[PDB]
């Protein structure tokens, strides 16, 4: 239309984008600052990179480019590109991106009394310290900071404006607990220029139900049935090989749950302390397997049982275990020949008993180390993960 | 040619890219939009982006750009490149693409009578909610919304034209159902304007074939192998070798499962599901192989069999499975000699026949332990898998 | 120079670069294309794009830029960067890249009458489906669509040249069959305009030595190695542990093996059918050997042998598999004590004898098995690998 | 303001930004350098590439940018866009990104009186070489070198400022020493001209925490746990499935680490030297294992124990390791029957020690084995820990 | 200041970016291209792609940038920038980035007489083939090419000067061994226009500390180590899975090591010959394990032994191995139960003797397959080894 063109025509005469649009040099602009969050993408544990998806918001008065709607009828508003006008260099300081820019610029929406509004989407990959102390009960605080780069407070003075999540995604992995801000003034040495500012932190509640599903429960069926060998009899031959595969089944599991934390080192996470503590019981079952079986097959031609040991074994465990402990001259010669055989048999089964009371005292060990284990593991996985604050939280949250 | 030259030189005469080309300023333009969907590259299940080929579509009339073909013979369309006319601001809102405008800017081709032209190509990465709780056999609905950044409906009202599919290539990996759309108008608070768009939804369902051939059946080979330690003898020492063996070849099985689905934790997966019922499954079975070696190895000389137990196992199962249980003075002293002997022949054979009845009992406890763990394997993998929706569909089509 | 100086200052006099260079308007320009393979970089089975190294060819004869060579001596040619004279807009139809033009823009080589060259290098990534029917021993045809993007063939005429494949470097994976091409026309349906491309197919062929090397070989070593088992005696205890360690590491080769092939579903792949029958295989050895197992610790007091079973395989399968089966009141009371222990002796030996029976009946068994199991695994082996087409030539020419 | 308006319009009058803005032509330009490290990203190992965040700080003098503040009051400061001041072509020497320039250009702040200010943010990715010759203890020392691209010491002479740490955010994998730098001159062959610049070095330690509770303690546990072999009693047969399978979790574990350490061939690093003891130690290990028992099932009927091999080990060993080793015709055919049975049992029992001496034997090489083995393993991984520098300093920070 | 202000309008008067800056528009212009090698980041074996840190080096003379230092006093040297003045279109023609010209565009320094220097640096991707026939005692010859893109020989004749090395930075993994290079002219068909080029091609050496401690050692000691099953006695039931494990231990190694050659189909790796190898050995190793087996636990009953047989093994072998083998009715009743217990005992013991015989026959084979086993592995590991060509200068330098 002829009306809008001769607007346009004569808007940009004469216009500096270089020049702060204020009708007196010596007060500040205006200038108002707001969030539109739409999606968490990504929260990079091991680099410490939190990926997401904003529109920002801005908005200001300008005082060039005004007009009277009755010289031109029929056009409200106009539209200008990038370069044309002038617009506030607001920049995410905390930035990660190759790119420090990561704002796709759009037009910019103009009134007709020069109120101007800009919202220029991207995808933001800023830099948050991520603690893993409580994975995977944790709650992270990540931070967005937002100023101008080279204007003052008595040229540019931001305002804030409450976030805004209507349009938000939610995000099978995170839940969104919220997204605070608050204006803050940073003065100078020389000089009383306040410096405005605008931070948005990102609260955020990790969802356990993938985690608790994928690796608490297998890890603990694991270490459960690694206690079933002290209910194996020591005659079979498969003790060591049992307990020994159980190890090699926890150190796979071990090498598929590495590459999920990151490599930090200012706290031990609650997954390596509840790891470190199954392997440790794993590998001090097997320890008394060993001794169980070097009890079991001992020579009944050595040393005998030392009384200390067999009276607090024998007796007072099985007290405790209620457990019972099993139990002419022809003639002359052939004589002579019976009577050897019947003494070597005698001897025999004199050793056999000797031999059955030492199988006695593994068998009635192994209970014994049976019942510690279990208690030992029982308490040990119920306190770890029990110390994590938030726990009853999360899981009345991700399971119910 | 000189008639072409002097038509490039007369159009671009007093031309604002900036300005809408309309007759009257008051009256809205009408912009058509369509699509034409080529090939679904990538549908990324962790992060949620679906890469997809496209063609945009828009036409609309300009005002300005018209002339008489009598006065410029042989001429009869132009060509118009980036920043030279205007052309519309049509934008996916759900994008995922750190450069949020993904289209390769073309040409513009006009009419002789002002209509152009634009079909830009381009890659888009757009975001959508991703549903795995039929896994592998779900069925998505990703969305792509289309509308003017800036451009009101009193200004610029969007029309949909029907989604091309006429140049689709088939993908090996999703089978595409429909791309349907329709036309929406989304009043605002302040104003009357309406606010149109275009939104094209993509249903599109996975093909099953890949993960039935290489999850479902290894794993419940495995599953079913693993049931083969009830028919084998006590006698032989590999019962907890091979179940734990099975149990090993489980797990790494699962570490290489792990990397596929995403990190959801909104749902559990049917994979998962099932892949915790044969864990389980195998479990149990590790158990009750370990009490009927212990059942086997009794002592001959410990607690008698209780009446209770005898009754219901040797007598109930063995009429439930039909099996059957098998089954001077020198003449005086070699006299003695003799007597002990054979006395102690005798109390070895009880000895024997008392163990005998033992391993009767485990070899029967053995039969019933197989038969109800196969009924509960069999009965599990049916309903896990029968549960999912659309299950006779898949099997129809990815297998026929 | 002066001359030179003066010519670029003539030349560019009234020169728009958006105007088609011909004498009459109604009458096409012909321009003419053709290829310059270079090298074959990568070709992504999964995600199915095709990366190349190009050199386009363009040439076409223009109106406007011709002088005398006379008028300026010692000058024959000139160069026009980037956006200072037309060229045409041909693009891939069938492009992969994010940037959809991956051509590198390069200078305009001038004739001293009109005729113009072009050559921009850039890497292409197309997008080809890609068959794995027959992998490793596929043949797949790739093709590259060229053509303008808005005009016409009233307009522009492409013309095909032959491609070059002179500077062609070969790629150790691949072996480059040819690069045929032809001109084709697409009229429309309003309209009788041609609308001509060239479209370049690439057919290439995959080198097998590689896959042959490590997959092939290595499988089949392992399955012979696990048929060891029916030669393995019975009264050693690792017959089932060394079934399952073979089974275990086939799984470990199936978790090597399962990242190379894509998640296609519209055919099951070569690899994929030898191993299911490789698995198939083993598996059923394993069930086997479980029999055999049972067979030989059979209670000498259980059931007889059925008289079916015993001519079944003690007769008939010994004459096919040629082996033998092996084979004064005192002086009363000591003498009942020696005829007790004579009858005890002598059911002991009957026992053992038909103990030894049902050995030599797993023995016998053992070897049927075994051949059987032969047969069908190197019947099956032949018969997967053979079916393939040029299979034959295949290992002609990458192992002779 | 139209103040500022007048200055913007002034200011750029005869303004070329290829100008060096000296009052003399003949005399240097002052510009100071400095920096503000803010996050250590990414240390690369194996590409060795540092990614820091840096905030460049540049500042000197101008000679036509000045003004009068009396002439423009309300008007102090001045900013211009990149390409319209002339500014420094400071570039980091040693990069390692495909853009050389990884800096967001950003305005540049005018005085009053022609001081100027440049604070362009950016991600650098430097190439500084990466010593792991005693990882994970070790400490790098990466440089980055700043300078003019083109212009002299007589044009432009570079001053170092000291570097700003004070926004410098913590990293929970490397801890920040400090980052000196100094400024130094060189002279080239030709000319006396001098050539300014400005290098930082950084230092920083790892921190160990981690690596010494994921690699060394597991590792150590195992190789503990491999020792019990010696403790196993011989008549039960799980000695070499025990030592085979720790020798397993050790390759498992080494394939686990292998990923971590580059590829360099300079030094042995000291988690390969310590690897490669606890693997030589576990080999050693299982060799004794086999010696031993082919010790224990020595055939009774072979050679006899050489007089040097028995006063070397039963009475030697058994004095160090004070263990004690354990310990009427018809009548004359009976006659002789029962003689031939007694001589036949005779015979057996002498077998029977003759065996019980061989089993004593490797029963008392076994445990002087277990120490040797004990002691070497201890002292090599003290040792090897120990040698390295800085690790009491490490363990005091990172543990304490 | 205003001397070089005036210089700087006076340059680029009537200058035409686009016009070669020759006196003579007939003769060429002499350019002098040379290279500065920085750092060998990167060298692809799988994709064929070689990353280097380049600075270019060019030098021509300039015919219309010249003047008088005398009227300008104070200046020296001119700087321009990119799309001011003509410089050389000087491309890698055998490039493998996306962007083919990799070069950052820096400033032009300009003498006072016309000469110019150009010194862009870039990292550059090429892409030369890589050969792996000695992996890992390779060494290879990668190309760059350079040359001008449109410019001829009559126009533009490239001179080449020699490579510096003088601020190379040394590579942990490769060796430089120089960086030769040629000047080259290629005729064409129709014209005696010769075309130069400058090629620098570069030699560098692999270094083979990392692999030979990692792969080489612990696969030999591994191989080393499967051959204690000979010397372990068959009475002990771990023969088979001690092989197997070594076996599996191989396939681990086997799937650790798949992931760093290539997957070419030229020809067969060194390391693949020598995997090969000792896979192949331990299966025989397996089997001949297994045949020693079958051979102990042969049947006393069955048939016995073929004279051929036993005069090959017992007598020469034991000959060559040097091993010795080891070695008054009840009256008349009661005689006849003696007499038959005695028959039994003396059947019990030839039968026992039988067997004995055979198990000497199993323990003599054993050593003998050890002695040739050893042999083999020991001949096969030395052999491959020293096959490969300046092995000895590898283990030279590499390792002292
Ligand atoms: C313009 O360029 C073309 C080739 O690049 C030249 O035309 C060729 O000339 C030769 C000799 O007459 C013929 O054999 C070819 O058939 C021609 N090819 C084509 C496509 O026309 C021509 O020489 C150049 N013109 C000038 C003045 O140099
Ligand atoms: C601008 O502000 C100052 C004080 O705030 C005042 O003295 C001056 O008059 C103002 N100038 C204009 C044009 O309003």
Chains 1, 2, 3, 4, 5 share one sequence.
């Not at 617009?87 to 796709?104: Q, V």
């Not at 101007?116 to 989407?121: G, I």
């Not at 605070?180 to 500012?197: A, I, L, T």
């Amino acid at each position: 239309g002829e009306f809008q063109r001769k607007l346009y025509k004569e808007l940009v005469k004469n216009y500096n984008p270089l020049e702060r649009p204020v009708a007196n040099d010596s007060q500040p602009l205006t200038v108002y600052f707001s969030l539109s969050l739409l999606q968490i993408m990504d929260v990079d544990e091991k680099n410490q990179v939190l990926t997401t998806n904003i529109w920002l918001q801005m908005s200001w008065t300008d005082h060039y480019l005004q007009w009277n709607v009755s010289e031109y009828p029929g056009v409200k508003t106009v539209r200008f590109p990038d370069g044309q006008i002038w617009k506030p260099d607001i920049l995410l300081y905390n930035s990660a991106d190759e790119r420090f820019d990561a704002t796709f610029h759009t037009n910019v929406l103009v009134n007709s009394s020069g109120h101007c509004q800009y919202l220029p989407p991207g995808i933001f990959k800023s830099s948050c310290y991520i603690d893993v102390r409580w994975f995977p009960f944790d709650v992270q605080h990540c931070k967005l900071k937002f100023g101008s780069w080279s204007y003052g407070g008595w040229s540019l003075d931001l305002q804030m404006q409450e976030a805004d999540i209507s349009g938000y995604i939610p995000n099978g992995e995170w839940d969104l607990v919220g997204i605070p801000g608050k204006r803050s003034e940073r003065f100078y040495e020389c000089c009383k220029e306040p410096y405005p500012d605008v931070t948005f932190t990102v609260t955020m509640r990790r969802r356990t139900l993938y985690y608790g599903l994928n690796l608490l429960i297998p890890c603990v069926l694991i270490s459960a049935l690694a206690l079933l060998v002290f209910l194996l009899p020591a005659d079979s031959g498969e003790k060591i090989s049992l307990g020994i595969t159980v190890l090699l089944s926890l150190t796979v599991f071990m090498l598929l749950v590495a590459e999920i934390m990151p490599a930090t080192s200012d706290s031990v996470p609650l997954i390596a302390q509840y790891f470190a503590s199954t392997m440790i019981i794993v590998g001090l079952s097997v320890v008394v397997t060993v001794i169980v079986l070097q009890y079991h097959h001992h020579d009944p031609d050595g040393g005998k049982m030392p009384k200390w040991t067999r009276v607090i074994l024998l007796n007072w465990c099985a007290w405790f275990l209620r457990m019972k402990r099993p139990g002419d001259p022809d003639l002359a010669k052939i004589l002579e020949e019976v009577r050897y055989i019947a003494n070597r048999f005698r001897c025999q089964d004199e050793s056999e008993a000797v031999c059955s009371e030492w199988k006695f005292a593994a068998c009635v060990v192994d209970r014994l180390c049976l019942m510690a284990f279990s208690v030992f593991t029982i308490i040990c996985t119920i306190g770890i993960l029990m110390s994590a604050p938030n726990f009853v939280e999360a899981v009345s949250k991700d399971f119910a």
